[model samples]
Target: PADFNGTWEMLSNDNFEDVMKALDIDFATRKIAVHLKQTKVIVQNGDKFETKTLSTFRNYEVNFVIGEEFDEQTKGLDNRTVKTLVKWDGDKLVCVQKGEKENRGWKQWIEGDLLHLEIHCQDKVCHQVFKKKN
Candidate 1:
């Protein structure tokens, strides 16, 4: 199993603006978000996980257990409610959000000391890489 318990600092974000646009995020928020450096703080306990996506302008947090479906209210980031489920696909953590948006999901995996997050909404996909903090 991949250990994804640590603080990760963003290294790169690709096409994040496209994803924000697909989510119908306001232009002002997208402008600030695209330029901001995001940090990911993850705490994992067995199959349960607590994750936080933090930035200078905003923060988003989620808590979930693997293989369980729960209601997810995406506050500060689209502000929508969805049914979310996370499952392990080998070493990768795969998530699916069922709501108004089509093809909305994300994947998280670790390689060496780096964490990769792929967020997708509709036709746009944003790839973000993070280096694990020592």
Candidate 2:
């Protein structure tokens, strides 16, 4: 199994604004969000995980267990409610969010000392890379 229990800092973000636009995020929020540096804090215990995406402007937190589905309210981000399910595909963690939006989900994986995240919404996909914090 992949060990994903550590703090990570964003190295690069690509097409993040597109994903935000697909989520209907306002221009003001999107502008601030696009420029803010994000830090990811993850705590993994067995199949349960606690994750936080932190930034100066806003912070988002999520807790979920593998193979279990729950209601996810994207609080500081887009402020949407969706049914979310998470599963493991080999070493990668895959998530499916079902709600108003079509093809909404995210994938997370680790490669060496880097953490990779891909967020999908509507027809837009955003890729973000993070480095494991020392």
Candidate 3:
């Protein structure tokens, strides 16, 4: 089962370029984003999840139900509203963002004490890593 109910800090970032580019990120925003050391704190109670992406520059937070549908706001990113749903596929946590952008979504997984998050939009994908708080 997915027990992602704790705080996690980013240890490394694999590829964030694609995510930003897919969202039509400007040069200046990309520059600032690339330098951000993002961290996430996730609190999961049963099928409900309260997730927050934190950084020195800015922070983003969202709440969702595992099997229910809800409106999502990307906030700091290319602010957009969409119907989002997240589910656990084995140990892989998957998110589907249904909106103007045809096929857009993201997935997350955990390996040992490392947490990996992949964000995708259109034809681009970005991968990020974080350390789970034990």
Candidate 4:
């Protein structure tokens, strides 16, 4: 598995609004979130991970152990409750979020100094790329 243990700066976020709207995020939040650049910090200890998604307006954190199902609240994001489980899929991190929305989840992969996050909700998919900040 690839180790994601550093700060990453957002490079590009494509179709994020579609995914946010699918999650029923408020218009005000979408307006702010779409324009703000997001930062991600990940602390990985083997199968246990602590991840934080940060921005100027709001931030969200999630901690979980691999293969173990945990309750996750979107908090500053969509304010939704879901059961999330994370696992490795050929060096890529895959998270499955089971809740009100169908096919809601995320996948993460790293290529050299870049990290890619693909967030999906219902039928919409959003791609966010980040560069590792040294």
How many clashes in each structure?
A: 0, 0, 0, 0
lDDT of 2 by residue, 1-134 (tens): 89999999999999999999999999988898888889999999989999998989788899999999999998866888999999999999999999999999999999999999999998999999999998
What is candidate 4's CA lDDT for residue 46?
91
The alpha-carbon lDDT assigned to residue 81 of candidate 1 equals 96
lDDT of each: 0.95, 0.94, 0.84, 0.92
TM-score of model 4 (CA atoms): 0.96
TM-score of 3: 0.93
Which residue pairs in model 4 clash with each other? Answer: none
Q: Cα-based RMSD of the predictions, in order?
A: 0.8, 0.8, 1.3, 0.9
Per-prediction TM-score: 0.97, 0.97, 0.93, 0.96
Tens digits of lDDT, candidate 3, 7-115? 8888877667767877887878888888788879998887788899889867989888888989988886888888999988997889999987767888988888888
Q: Which stretches of candidate 3 lie above 4 Å from their native place?
A: none
lDDT of 3 at 27: 73
- lDDT tens digits, residues 1-134, model 4? 78899999999999999999999998888988899998999999999899998999688898999899999988866888999999999889999999999999999999999999999999999999999999
Query: Residue-wise lDDT of candidate 1 within 1-134, one digit each (tens)?
Result: 78999999999999999999999998998998898999999999989999998989689899999999999998857989999999999999999999999999899999999999999999999999999999
Residue 126, model 4, lDDT: 96
Deviation of model 4 at 128, angstroms: 0.3
